[PDB]
Design a protein around this ligand. Structure first.
Ligand SMILES: Cc1cc2nc3c(=O)[nH]c(=O)nc-3n(C[C@H](O)[C@H](O)[C@H](O)COP(=O)(O)OP(=O)(O)OC[C@H]3O[C@@H](n4cnc5c(N)ncnc54)[C@H](O)[C@@H]3O)c2cc1C
Ligand SMILES: Cc1cc2nc3c(=O)[nH]c(=O)nc-3n(C[C@H](O)[C@H](O)[C@H](O)COP(=O)(O)OP(=O)(O)OC[C@H]3O[C@@H](n4cnc5c(N)ncnc54)[C@H](O)[C@@H]3O)c2cc1C
Lengths: 105, 504, 504, 105
C-alpha cells in the first residue's frame, strides 16, 4: 500500500505478527545513504502490494533496534508471519529491488 | 556476597565507556549509566560524554571551518584562486557538525551493545558502598536500585560560571552551548584564557565574527609561556582583541544583546557572552556525602589515588572527575581500561601520568609534551637545563607575505606578520641532554607532537634528534637541526622572509 | 704539495653547499662552482640545485595550491562557506612560486658568502686528480683552472627523457619546466609513476586540469604497495585517469597540441606531455673518463663508498649523483657535512643510510620509514613479522561525506569515497616486536612521520606505541591503539562512517 | 635629478667616485618591500637635487652586492666623494625621508 512510521516496540510487534508478510526499513535521519534510497522504497510500497511496507527511526524507537541487532543503516529485513527470513544492507536500489521480487514479485 | 553486576559505572564518556568495555571483555557483567543534565541554557545531547558532543570532536570540526576561512581570506589569492562574495553560513556549519555528532552517538551506543554492556539512560547516584539508585530518563517519580561488586564514578566535568558576577549564570553561554547555538554568535565576548577560551575565540574570529577575549593576568595559564605569547600574538594579528586584566563585573539582559560592565568601569554591548574560565567535577547530585568519600571541594573532584581508588574500597574514579588527572579523552580511556584489567584480570599495571602529550587547536596550533622552560628551571636549576630553540616561518605561509590585521598595526608601516612557528626542546645537561620538554607552535601541532611524545617516552637525548634525518620541506624537521641555545645568547629569530619590512 | 684551495666542490645544491659551509667553518679554504645547464626545453634557474628551484620547494608550494582547491570544491560547502565563480589562475601561481624561489636564491648566495666560501657561477669539469677546469658564465671561450687538495662532486641529477620514443625529447617537458611554465598546462599526460609523476598529476588535477597518467606496470615502485594502491585509488576518486600498462610510443608536434600514439595503438591529443620516469646522474660533461673513475653507466651515477670516496683518493661524491644514496635533500646535506668533518676535523663519524624517513606529497600524502610489508617478509620471513594496521577516516573529511568523481563511479550508487587513511606498523616478532617499518597514508604525512622516524631510530617496540598516550583528535594517534594484525585475519577496514553506501 | 639603473660594477664605481654626493637603492624585483618603497624613492630624486639618485638590481649586478655586503633589501647607502657614510634598511618611507634630509635637506 504505502509506508508508515512506527513509533513503538508494541506497534512494530503487533503489526508484523498479525500481518504475515512484512518488509521493514530501518533508517536514520542523519544517514545520507538511508535518505538516498528512501524515495525508491516509497515507490515499491505502491507497486508490490503483496507485502507490508514500514519504517523505523532507529534513534526514536530505541528498543526495537537494540533487538533486531541493527548496527548500520539502511538495513532491510523481511518477515514471514512474524519471523525474519532475510536481511539486506545498503543504499543500492538494484539490490533492494532484487530483494523485494524475491519475496513479493 | 552477591551483586546484580560485577561492575556498575556512572557516566558514558571516554573513561566510563572504555572501562566498561574492557571489563566486559574479561568476563564481568557490566552496567553503565549515562544521563545528560541540561546546561545553564538548557542544551542537551547524546551519549559519549563531553568529548564527542561538546568538546574535542565538534571543536576540531569548527576549527577546520575557521582554518579553511583563514586560507580563503589570507592565502588563496596569492596561490592563484579567484572567487566572489565569500560569506559563511553559521546555521549550515552547526547542522553539519550536529549530524556528525549524532552519528557518533549511535555508533558509541551499538559499540556498548556489542561488548555486552547494558546501558541505561538514567540519572544515577549511590545509596550505598555497593548500591546505586537511578531514575529512568531523568524522571524522579520512580527510583530503582541495583548492586555492584565495584562501582566506577566517571561523571566528568561541566563548565563553571562564577557566582560573584551578576547576570552571568543567567545570560552567558558555555562550551556546552557554542557547538549547537541556534543564533549566529555575532559580536562575542569570551571570558577566560584557558585552551578552551582561546580555541573558541580563534575559530569564531576566523569564521568572521568580532571577537573579544577578557584575560585576568596571563593566557594559557599552566603552559610554557613563550609559546603562550606566540599563540596570543598570532591571534591578535588576525583580529581577536584581548582585554588584558579586565574581567566582567556585571551582565544585564537587554533585548537581543547583552551589556557588560567591566572592572575598569568601562562598558560594551555584545551579542554573546561565552564563559570559559574552567570546569568543576560533576559530583553534587551523587550523594557522596553519605559515604564520607573525600573530595577536593574547590575542584569538586574526587580524591582518587594512583590505582583510581577512592577512600571507599569498592568505588573508583577516573577521567575529568578525579583530581590531578589531565582532562584529555585518551587519558581517561587508558585509566578506565587499566582499572578494568586490575579489577577483572588480576593485572598489576598502574597508570602512568608522566609525559602526556597535549595539543591546543588555536588558529596557530601549539603542541607540547613534558616540562615548560620555566618549570624545568624551577625543578632542576636554570644552570642545569639547556633550551635549544628556533623561530621560523612555515614554507607555504611564508610565500604569501601575509599582513597584520589593522588592530595589531602599531604604525602604518607595521604590516608584515610575526614569524609563524617555534620549535623548542628542553634538555637535562647532566643527563647527556635527555629531552624532558618538547614544544612546537605552528600548523598541525597534534600531528607533529605525537611521534615526538613517543620519543620522549623512550628517553630521547638531544643527540638523537641531531642524528635523525629530517623530512623536507616540513615544519617538524626544524627539530632535527636545532642548535641555537638560550644560554649561548645567539639570535633564534626567523632567518630570512620579508618580515620587519625588509626581505633577506 | 700545495693547492689553491683545500676544498673545491662542483655543484651548488643541498649537498655541495652544505659540505662547503661545514668545511669552511673548520678552517678550509673553499671554492664552490655552480652552473645550470638549461633543460630539454631551455628552462634555467638560480643557485641551490634541484631542491630549491625545480624540486621540493616549488613542488610543496603548488601542492598547497592544489590541496587548497580540493578544500574549496569538496569540503567548503559542508562547513558553511559560500562563494561564486571559483577559478584558478596559473600565471599568478607561477609568479608567486618564482618570486619565492628567487628570494631563496639570494639568501643561499649570501649564506655562502657569510661562511667565507667563494662561489663562481661557472661550468666545471676536472682536468686532473687535483685540478678543475672551468668556464665563467657558461662561455667556453676562456678555460681557467684551479687546484684543490680534495675535490667533491655534487652535481646531482636531471630528468631522463627516453631515446626510443620519437618526439619525446623534443616536445615533452619535465620537472625542470613544470614549475615555471608560461602556458597553462591544460590537458596533461604525465608519463611515469614515481613520486614525482604522482605529485605533479595530483596538484595539476586539484588545480582543475584534465590529467592522465601512463603507468607501465605499478605505481610507486620501491614503496610499500598497499599504501601505493591507497594513494592511487584516492587520486582516481578525485579525477585523475591511469592508463595502466600503456606507455607512449611516439609524439608528434601538431600546432599548440601534441598527439600521442600509445603501445596499444590508440591515440589522443594533449596540451602538455610531462615525462617523469626517472633521473640520471649529471656526470657526462665532467671528464671523469680521463681519470678512470668508476661510474654505474645505467644510472650515470658515481660509485662512491661508505665514506663518500670514489676510486680516485682525492675526489668525493655525495647526494643524488652518488649511486645507492636516497635522492632527498636532507640526506645530501648530512653526507656533505659528515664528509667535511672527516676531511677537515679528523672526525670518524660515518654516514648512516638506514631508516631514512620519506614523505610523498600526493593529494593524499604518504610517509614511511623502514621496510615495506613485502620486503620485511622476504628479508625476515612472513611467519616472523607482525603487521599491525588500520584503515580509518580523517575526522574533518569524514564529516563532509565526499563523493567519488564520476570517472571512478562503477554504478550510479557507487558514490561514497573509500576510507582516506591507513596506519601500518611492520614488526619483528622474535625481537619483542621491534618496529622495523612505519607507514602512514593520510593528510600531513610529513609532519606525522618525522617523530616516528625518530622513534624507529631509538629501536621502539610495538609495546612502546601502546603505552604512549595518543593526542586526540588527530590522524597520528591511530598508531597508539593499533591492535588488528594481518595474521589474525580480523577486519582492518574503516569502522563506521558513511562508507560503502551504508552508515556503518 | 631622477633615478637610473646601473648595470655594471665599473659604472657604479665611476658614477659614485666622480659625482661626490650619492645615494643608492639596492633593490630586488622579487622583493615586496623593495617594490613598496620604489615610488617614493623616485619622488625624492626629483625634490632633493643636492644628491645623485641611482638603483642597483642585486641579482643582475652580482659583483656590486658581494662587496657592499648587501644581505637584505631594500638597503640604502649614502656616499661622500666615494665612501659610504651611512646605511639604512627597510621599506619605511618615514625612515628614508628622515635619512635623505640628514644629508641633503
Ligand atoms: C570545549 C572542550 C574541548 C575539548 N577538547 C579536547 C581535545 O581537543 N582533545 C582532548 O583529548 N580533550 C578535549 N577536551 C577534554 C575531554 O573532552 C575530556 O577530558 C573527556 O571527555 C573526559 O571524559 P570523562 O570520562 O573523563 O568524562 P566526560 O566526558 O565528562 O563524560 C561523563 C559523562 O557523565 C555524565 N554524567 C554526569 N553525572 C551523571 C549522572 N549522575 N548520571 C549519569 N551520567 C552522568 C555526563 O553527561 C557525561 O556524558 C575538551 C573539553 C572541552 C570542554
Ligand atoms: C620534482 C622533484 C621533487 C622533489 N621533492 C623532494 C621532496 O619533497 N623532499 C625531498 O627531501 N627531496 C625532494 N627532491 C629531491 C631533491 O631535489 C634532491 O635530492 C636534492 O636537490 C639533492 O641535492 P644534491 O646536492 O645531491 O644535488 P642537486 O640539488 O641537484 O645539486 C646539483 C647542482 O649541480 C649543478 N651542476 C651540474 N653540473 C655542473 C657543473 N659542471 N658545474 C657547476 N654546476 C653543475 C646543477 O645545476 C645543480 O645546481 C625532489 C626532486 C624532484 C626532481
Amino acid at each position: 500500500g504505502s509506508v508508515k512510521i512506527v513509533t513503538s516496540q508494541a506497534e512494530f510487534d503487533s503489526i508484523i505478527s498479525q500481518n504475515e508478510l512484512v518488509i521493514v526499513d530501518f533508517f536514520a535521519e542523519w544517514c545520507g545513504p538511508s535518505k538516498r534510497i528512501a524515495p525508491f522504497y516509497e515507490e515499491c510500497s505502491k507497486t508490490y502490494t503483496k507485502m507490508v511496507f514500514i519504517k523505523v527511526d532507529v534513534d526514536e524507537v530505541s528498543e526495537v533496534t537494540e533487538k533486531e541487532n541493527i548496527t548500520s543503516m539502511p538495513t532491510f529485513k523481511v518477515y514471514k508471519n512474524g519471523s525474519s527470513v532475510d536481511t539486506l544492507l545498503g543504499a543500492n536500489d538494484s539490490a533492494l529491488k532484487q530483494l523485494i521480487e524475491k519475496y513479493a514479485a | 556476597h552477591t551483586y546484580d553486576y560485577d561492575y556498575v559505572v556512572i557516566g558514558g564518556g571516554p573513561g566510563g565507556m572504555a572501562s566498561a568495555k574492557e571489563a566486559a571483555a574479561h568476563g564481568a557483567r557490566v552496567l553503565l549509566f549515562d544521563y545528560v543534565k541540561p546546561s545553564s541554557q538548557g542544551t542537551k545531547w547524546g551519549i559519549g560524554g563531553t568529548c564527542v558532543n561538546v568538546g574535542c570532536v565538534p571543536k576540531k570540526l569548527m576549527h577546520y571551518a575557521g582554518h579553511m576561512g583563514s586560507i580563503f581570506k589570507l592565502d588563496s589569492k596569492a596561490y592563484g584562486w579567484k572567487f566572489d562574495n565569500l560569506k559563511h553560513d553559521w546555521k549550515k556549519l552547526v547542522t553539519t557538525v550536529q549530524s556528525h555528532i549524532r552519528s557518533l552517538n549511535f555508533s558509541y551506543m551499538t559499540g556498548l551493545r556489542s561488548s555486552k554492556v547494558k546501558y541505561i539512560n538514567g540519572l544515577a547516584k549511590l545509596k550505598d558502598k555497593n548500591t546505586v539508585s537511578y531514575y529512568l530518563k531523568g524522571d524522579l517519580s520512580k527510583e530503582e536500585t541495583v548492586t555492584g561488586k565495584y562501582i566506577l564514578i566517571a561523571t566528568g566535568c561541566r563548565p563553571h560560571i562564577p557566582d560573584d558576577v551578576e547576570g552571568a549564570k543567567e545570560l552567558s553561554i558555555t562550551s556546552d552551548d557554542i557547538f549547537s547555538l541556534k543564533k549566529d554568535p555575532g559580536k562575542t565576548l569570551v571570558v577566560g584564557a584557558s585552551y578552551v577560551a582561546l580555541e573558541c575565540s580563534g575559530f569564531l574570529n576566523s569564521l568572521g565574527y568580532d571577537v573579544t577575549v577578557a584575560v585576568r593576568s596571563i593566557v594559557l595559564r599552566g603552559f610554557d609561556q613563550q609559546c603562550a605569547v606566540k599563540v596570543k600574538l598570532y591571534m591578535e594579528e588576525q583580529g581577536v582583541m584581548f582585554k588584558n586584566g579586565i574581567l566582567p563585573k556585571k551582565l544585564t539582559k537587554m533585548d537581543d544583546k547583552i551589556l557588560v560592565e567591566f572592572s575598569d568601569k568601562t562598558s560594551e554591548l555584545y551579542d554573546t557572552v561565552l564563559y570559559a574560565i574552567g570546569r568543576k567535577g560533576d559530583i553534587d547530585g551523587l550523594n557522596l556525602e553519605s559515604l564520607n568519600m573525600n573530595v577536593n571541594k574547590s575542584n569538586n573532584k574526587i580524591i582518587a589515588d594512583h590505582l583510581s581508588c577512592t577512600n571507599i574500597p569498592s568505588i573508583f574514579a577516573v577521567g575529568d572527575v578525579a583530581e590531578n588527572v589531565p582532562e584529555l579523552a585518551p587519558v581517561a580511556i587508558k585509566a578506565g581500561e587499566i582499572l578494568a584489567r586490575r579489577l577483572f584480570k588480576d593485572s598489576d599495571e598502574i597508570m602512568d601520568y608522566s609525559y602526556i602529550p597535549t595539543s591546543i587547536y588555536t588558529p596557530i596550533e601549539y603542541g607540547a609534551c613534558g616540562y615548560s622552560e620555566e618549570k624545568a628551571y624551577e625543578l632542576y636549576g636554570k644552570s642545569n637545563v639547556e633550551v635549544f630553540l628556533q623561530e621560523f616561518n612555515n614554507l607555504e605561509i611564508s610565500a604569501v607575505h601575509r599582513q597584520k590585521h589593522i588592530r595589531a598595526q602599531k604604525d602604518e608601516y607595521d604590516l608584515d606578520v610575526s614569524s609563524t612557528c617555534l620549535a623548542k626542546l628542553v634538555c637535562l645537561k647532566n643527563e647527556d641532554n635527555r629531552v624532558i620538554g618538547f614544544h612546537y607552535v605552528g600548523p598541525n601541532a597534534g600531528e607533529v607532537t605525537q611521534g615526538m611524545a613517543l620519543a620522549l617516552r623512550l628517553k630521547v637525548k638531544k643527540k638523537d634528534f641531531d642524528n635523525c634525518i629530517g623530512i623536507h620541506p616540513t615544519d617538524a624537521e626544524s627539530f632535527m637541526n636545532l642548535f641555537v641555545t638560550i644560554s649561548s645568547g645567539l639570535s633564534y629569530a626567523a632567518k630570512g622572509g620579508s618580515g620587519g619590512g625588509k626581505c633577506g
